Scaffold this active site. Structure first.
Site, PDB file in Angstrom:
ATOM      1  N   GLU A 284       0.865  -1.215   0.000  1.00 53.63           N
ATOM      2  CA  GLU A 284       0.000   0.000   0.000  1.00 53.63           C
ATOM      3  C   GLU A 284       0.889   1.250   0.000  1.00 53.63           C
ATOM      4  OE1 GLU A 284      -2.610   0.621   3.341  1.00 53.63           O
ATOM      5  OE2 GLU A 284      -3.884   1.949   2.219  1.00 53.63           O
TER       6      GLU A 284
ATOM      7  N   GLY B  95       3.062   1.997  10.998  1.00 56.45           N
ATOM      8  CA  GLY B  95       2.876   1.181  12.164  1.00 56.45           C
ATOM      9  C   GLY B  95       2.647  -0.293  11.820  1.00 56.45           C
TER      10      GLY B  95
ATOM     11  N   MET C 276       0.381  -3.060   8.667  1.00 58.17           N
ATOM     12  CA  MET C 276      -0.334  -3.152   7.400  1.00 58.17           C
ATOM     13  C   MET C 276      -1.294  -4.328   7.391  1.00 58.17           C
ATOM     14  SD  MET C 276      -0.925  -1.904   4.572  1.00 58.17           S
ATOM     15  CE  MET C 276      -2.144  -2.613   3.489  1.00 58.17           C
ATOM     16  N   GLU C 277      -2.516  -4.073   6.945  1.00 57.21           N
ATOM     17  CA  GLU C 277      -3.607  -5.069   7.026  1.00 57.21           C
ATOM     18  C   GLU C 277      -3.695  -6.170   5.932  1.00 57.21           C
ATOM     19  OE1 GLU C 277      -4.018  -1.702   6.384  1.00 57.21           O
ATOM     20  OE2 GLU C 277      -5.617  -1.465   4.885  1.00 57.21           O
TER      21      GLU C 277
ATOM     22  N   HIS D 172      -6.696  -2.350  15.158  1.00 59.52           N
ATOM     23  CA  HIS D 172      -6.887  -1.595  13.908  1.00 59.52           C
ATOM     24  C   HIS D 172      -6.706  -2.502  12.659  1.00 59.52           C
ATOM     25  CE1 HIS D 172      -6.620   2.181  11.458  1.00 59.52           C
ATOM     26  NE2 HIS D 172      -5.767   1.452  10.755  1.00 59.52           N
ATOM     27  N   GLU D 173      -5.573  -3.200  12.572  1.00 58.85           N
ATOM     28  CA  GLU D 173      -5.266  -4.019  11.436  1.00 58.85           C
ATOM     29  C   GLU D 173      -6.267  -5.175  11.356  1.00 58.85           C
ATOM     30  OE1 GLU D 173      -3.403  -2.734   9.515  1.00 58.85           O
ATOM     31  OE2 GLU D 173      -2.498  -1.288  10.945  1.00 58.85           O
TER      32      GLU D 173
ATOM     33  N   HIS E 290      -9.567  -3.805   9.923  1.00 55.52           N
ATOM     34  CA  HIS E 290      -9.460  -3.669   8.484  1.00 55.52           C
ATOM     35  C   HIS E 290      -9.957  -4.856   7.677  1.00 55.52           C
ATOM     36  CE1 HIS E 290      -8.059   0.181   7.268  1.00 55.52           C
ATOM     37  NE2 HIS E 290      -6.926   0.136   7.923  1.00 55.52           N
TER      38      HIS E 290
ATOM     39  N   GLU F 112      -9.927   4.177   6.291  1.00 58.07           N
ATOM     40  CA  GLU F 112      -9.096   4.628   7.436  1.00 58.07           C
ATOM     41  C   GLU F 112      -9.852   5.358   8.541  1.00 58.07           C
ATOM     42  OE1 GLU F 112      -6.531   3.309   8.044  1.00 58.07           O
ATOM     43  OE2 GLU F 112      -5.849   2.610   6.047  1.00 58.07           O
TER      44      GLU F 112
END
Ligand SMILES: N[C@@H](CCC(=O)O)C(=O)O
Ligand code: NA
Ligand code: NA
Ligand code: NA
Ligand code: NA
Ligand code: NA
Ligand code: NA
Ligand code: NA
Ligand code: NA
Ligand code: NA
Ligand code: NA
Ligand SMILES: [Zn+2]
Length: 867
Positions: free
Chosen positions: A118, A258, A260-261, A294-295, A298, A317
């Site tokens: 990404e 930080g 990545m998903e 968070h990830e 996603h 996001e």
């Protein structure tokens, strides 16, 4: 050097790729990639296929196994003409992971190989439709040296594997969900693995695997725990289960963001995985939690529903940030979460929305898409989702989420699609609300009140406007959800009502100017305004000090107590910065110190809340209060305020510090709140009588049974320049130099030191054994912290800060443009500073503009800044 792209130019792709079969013959120096794609034409018959590629060595091109002659390479592209409507494309190309210093595409992280695709990194691996509305079913075969790379991972499940001659082996993976290529991942390396299991509520058992460097297995269990907590919470709150058999996470040391998903194979900066109680703070624990969540979140908001185009980034996001916040908030202290997120909004994102880089959460124009992973897209994006939640309430909001997934699962969607789903499920009109997606800048909301004793009516007269930003000259009223509460003089809520009927406490502030009238207000109220920071706005209201201390004592929501404290201080911060500029020392009314004294001694206040009220606004939050920023005055005023409070509150500070002592260290919300309060008292105590302070700080440092307490003490030593500082700093170096993550904290302390010689110490540290310009975390900890978190030194009157940053960016521009562009942000804010500062900052930017091989990332920011 150009060229900007524009949202309004979106067009559906002439070709789709439905299935892609990849093979990597992996080697650090030279990797051979073979990509077999099934393509389908959707556009005109005569349209060529335009594939994106960067730094690829093209070896061959075939179409249905026929070597193709109708193609050409151009800048960033491979353009293939005269194609059938459906065909198999086969590309062979080479790349060099070891040369990849930008850390995008396939690159080397210590001895591991990993990817970051990404936004547009996949085009650094092979020629492809590197755009997120092209969704393909991937199958990935990895071939590599068995001894160097015993683990060969990609998205999905293992479907084949074999051994080869010359000590090689391979694994083939298959991921059944169609995906845009920014979600591709590959990792190869030698790791310790922590394995565990989560069982979903419908009984699916998911294998969980966390890959860490050899010797780091002792720092993995918290992250694994947080993943399970994330999966469970997304089930309970959103009704969402994981959709695959296995969930892999790889912690790597060289990573620009930080984490990545990537579907089923998240890759994390090791900062957001590794924790033990002697290495990591409470804050680290709660950050690991946040980012693992968070990830994980996603997987639905981002992966199962992706983005039509990069201008829709906030679709995933903002929503995913909203989800990580609700997760942290449900599990921990909702008040602390909200407060911190508000501190970030007001202190950091507001600054961006007043910068040359300002943009709406859904940008209209972008040159380098890596420049738009921003506080605005993320944090303001989430505030926008949270306004939708405010307006709909939870039950309707969750219906909108359900309609969103039902309409868009397995597609690439837009911000507009998300809003429409929320509107159709809820029957709340959000037409006007959409303007939050298209307009930049921070609205300013002005409130005037009137109480009428004859009519027993309270009237609010509310105005809004957003100043112009460099990107947009016309601004229009937004739909501002503006929550209020009205208090009688005993602290009871007064029912809001008009003409016999209840009125909603979320007022709809939709115009430039409106009046709201409340009836049956028998006694003059004190209002709480913009409760829970119900919109991301500046509030202009002429609070009395007494109204504010009343709210500190009586407001029903914890946030409003905090915020009233911030409004109380704000007046006196501004006062004392003007004084400081005339050489006048700090002046603070007695009754203000007494309001904080009362908080220290109120047994009924949640310590989580007390701690935050006793944490003074940062120099960044202080800066938002001013038209022109004086960073030296702000920093001296923050110090002076802290010393004033320390003196006035000394005995109460010591008492609360001692009372919150905890012999057992636990990572539990109540314990954290107490520790946070304890350490908030410590900050003031560090600025008391010198000997007493030196003893207390030094003792905390030496007797701590966890890093939270050791770091807080070291930080205080540094901040107050206590005599023990050099000895404690050297002790921490001696103990921890071999550990990058832990040394990052020390680098931050060095860079943010109030010492007169800070810059010189920071330059020296460029040669420290734990520093390297090859590692973004080290860069951000030492250099980035100097420039971005020590504005007083960065903005020294001799201009030495700017020159230092120019030298560092001169290197990074070539090495790693994304970290370079992060680090340039403070220089682009030049117009907030005085003329003499502006002049030196423009000169620094003009030097940078002249660099040979100026990256697009810096070109974008530098151009906007010099405009
Ligand atoms: N990839 C994000 C961080 C994590 C995320 O947004 O999923 C960024 O690059 O800033
Ligand atoms: Na292949
Ligand atoms: Na090319
Ligand atoms: Na992301
Ligand atoms: Na995603
Ligand atoms: Na909670
Ligand atoms: Na780039
Ligand atoms: Na990026
Ligand atoms: Na405060
Ligand atoms: Na600011
Ligand atoms: Na708590
Ligand atoms: Zn994200």
């Amino acid at each position: 050097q150009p060229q900007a792209k524009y949202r309004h130019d979106y067009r559906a792709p002439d070709y789709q790729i439905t299935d892609i079969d990849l093979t990597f013959d992996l080697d650090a120096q030279k990797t051979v990639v073979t990509a077999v794609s099934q393509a389908v034409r959707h556009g005109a018959s005569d349209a060529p296929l335009r594939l994106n590629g960067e730094d690829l060595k093209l070896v061959s091109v075939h179409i249905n196994d026929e070597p193709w002659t109708a193609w050409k390479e151009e800048e960033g592209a491979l353009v293939i003409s005269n194609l059938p409507e459906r065909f198999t494309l086969k590309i062979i190309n080479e790349i060099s992971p070891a040369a990849n210093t930008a850390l995008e595409g396939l690159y080397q992280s210590g001895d591991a190989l990993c990817t970051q695709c990404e936004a547009e990194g996949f085009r650094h691996i092979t020629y492809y439709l590197d755009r997120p509305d092209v969704l393909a079913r991937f199958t990935t075969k990895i071939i590599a040296d068995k001894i160097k790379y015993p683990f060969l991972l990609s998205n999905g499940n293992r479907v084949a594997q074999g051994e080869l001659e010359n000590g090689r082996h391979w694994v083939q993976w298959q991921d059944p969900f169609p995906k845009p290529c920014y979600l591709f991942a590959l990792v190869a390396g030698d790791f310790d693995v922590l394995r565990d299991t989560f069982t979903t509520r419908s009984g699916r058992e998911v294998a969980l695997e966390l890959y860490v460097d050899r010797g780091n297995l002792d720092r993995a269990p918290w992250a694994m725990t947080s993943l399970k907590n994330s999966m469970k919470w997304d089930e309970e709150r959103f009704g969402l289960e994981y959709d695959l058999d296995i969930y892999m996470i790889v912690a790597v040391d060289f990573f620009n963001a930080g984490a990545m998903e990537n579907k089923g194979l998240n890759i994390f900066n090791s900062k957001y995985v590794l924790a033990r109680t002697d290495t990591a703070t409470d804050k680290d624990y709660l950050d690991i939690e946040r980012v693992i969540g968070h990830e994980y979140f996603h997987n639905w908001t981002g992966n199962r529903v992706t983005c039509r185009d990069w201008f829709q980034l906030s679709l995933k996001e903002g929503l995913t940030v909203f989800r990580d916040q609700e997760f942290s908030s449900d599990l921990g202290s909702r008040a602390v979460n909200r407060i911190n997120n508000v501190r970030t909004m007001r202190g950091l994102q507001f600054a961006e929305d007043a910068s040359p880089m300002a943009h709406p959460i859904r940008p209209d124009m972008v040159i380098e898409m890596n420049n738009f992973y921003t506080l605005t897209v993320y944090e303001k994006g989430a505030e926008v989702i949270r306004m939708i939640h405010t307006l709909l309430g939870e039950e309707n909001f969750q219906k909108g989420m359900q309609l969103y997934f039902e309409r868009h699962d397995g597609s690439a969607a837009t911000c507009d699609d998300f809003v429409q789903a929320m509107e159709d499920a809820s029957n709340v009109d959000l037409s006007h609300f959409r303007r939050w997606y298209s307009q930049s800048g921070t609205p300013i909301v002005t409130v005037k009140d009137d109480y009428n004793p004859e009519t027993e009516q309270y009237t609010l007269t509310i105005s809004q406007r957003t100043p112009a930003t460099p990107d947009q000259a016309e601004k229009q009223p937004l739909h501002i959800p503006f929550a209020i509460e009205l208090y009688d003089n005993e602290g009871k809520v007064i029912p809001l009502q008009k003409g016999g009927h209840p009125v909603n406490s979320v007022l709809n502030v939709t115009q430039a100017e409106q009046t709201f009238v409340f009836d049956n207000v028998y006694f003059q109220p004190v209002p709480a305004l913009l409760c829970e920071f119900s919109a991301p706005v500046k509030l202009e209201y002429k609070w009395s000090d007494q109204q504010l201390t009343f709210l500190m004592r009586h407001a029903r929501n914890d946030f409003s107590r905090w915020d009233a404290a911030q409004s109380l201080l704000a007046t006196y911060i501004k006062l004392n910065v003007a004084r400081h500029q005339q050489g006048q020392p700090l002046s603070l009314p007695v009754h203000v110190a007494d309001a904080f004294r009362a908080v220290l001694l109120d047994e009924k206040i949640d310590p989580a809340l007390a701690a935050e009220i006793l944490t003074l606004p940062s120099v960044n939050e202080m800066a938002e209060l001013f038209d022109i920023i004086d960073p030296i005055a702000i920093a001296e005023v923050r110090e002076a305020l802290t010393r004033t409070l320390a003196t006035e509150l000394a005995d109460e500070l010591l008492a609360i510090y001692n009372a919150n002592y905890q012999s057992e260290y636990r990572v539990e919300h109540e314990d954290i709140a107490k520790r946070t309060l304890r350490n908030a008292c410590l900050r003031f105590l560090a600025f008391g009588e010198t000997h007493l302070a030196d003893v207390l700080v030094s003792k905390q440092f030496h007797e701590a049974n966890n890093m939270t307490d050791a770091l807080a003490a070291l930080s205080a030593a540094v901040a107050a320049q206590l005599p023990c500082r050099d000895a404690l700093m050297q002790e921490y170096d001696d103990k921890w130099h071999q550990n990058g993550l832990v040394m990052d904290k020390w680098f931050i302390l060095q860079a943010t030191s109030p010492a007169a010689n800070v810059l010189e110490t920071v330059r020296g540290l460029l040669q420290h054994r734990s520093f390297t310009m090859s590692n973004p975390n080290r860069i951000r900890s030492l250099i980035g912290a100097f420039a971005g978190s020590n504005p007083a030194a960065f903005h020294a009157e001799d201009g030495s800060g700017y020159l230092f940053l120019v030298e560092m960016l001169t290197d990074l521009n070539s090495r790693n443009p994304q970290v370079a562009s992060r680090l340039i942000e403070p220089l682009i804010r030049l117009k907030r500073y005085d003329a003499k500062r502006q002049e030196k900052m423009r000169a620094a930017l003009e030097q940078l503009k002249g660099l040979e091989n100026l990256s697009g990332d810096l070109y974008e920011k530098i151009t906007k800044a010099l405009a």
